[PDB]
Amino acid sequence: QDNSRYTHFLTQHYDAKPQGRDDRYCESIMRRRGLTSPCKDINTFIHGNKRSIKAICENKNGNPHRENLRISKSSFQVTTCKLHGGSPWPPCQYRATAGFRNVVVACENGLPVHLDQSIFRRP
Numbered sequence: 632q633d634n635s636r637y638t639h640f641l642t643q644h645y646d647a648k649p650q651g652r653d654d655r656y657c658e659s660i661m662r663r664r665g666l667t668s669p670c671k672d673i674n675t676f677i678h679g680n681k682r683s684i685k686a687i688c689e690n691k692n693g694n695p696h697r698e699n700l701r702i703s704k705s706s707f708q709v710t711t712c713k714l715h716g717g718s719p720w721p722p723c724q725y726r727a728t729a730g731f732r733n734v735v736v737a738c739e740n741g742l743p744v745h746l747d748q749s750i751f752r753r754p
Contacts, residue, residue: 642664643664644674646660646678648678648708652729654727657727661674668720670721672713672714675709676712677707687703688741693705699739702734702735703736706732708729709734709751710728712728
């Protein structure tokens with residue numbers, strides 16, 4: 632809330648660079664950040680520059696996309712960890728599907744406060 636809304640989104644999403652781009656990394660980070668209780672079905676850990684993340688809401692390094700969504704021009708490394716556990720409750724087996732592509736971070740107030748997992752629905 633109020634500047635920390637963005638980096639609540641970046642607690643969950645922004646993990647500046649992983650251990651590796653694999654399922655042991657994504658089970659580890661989902662455990663430690665704790666979207667593991669209950670298991671989040673799909674969540675992308677974004678990796679890159681934090682300066683780049685904020686600058687997606689700038690018009691220089693991110694285009695406006697309809698109604699306040701901001702599609703990036705500086706594609707980020709994005710490990711889209713999808714749950715292939717089966718259990719909704721912990722433990723959660725996360726299979727990492729690593730890709731590198733542009734995020735649609737939804738921006739309020741000059742801060743990307745959110746990010747659609749609409750792109751990252753089926754990685």
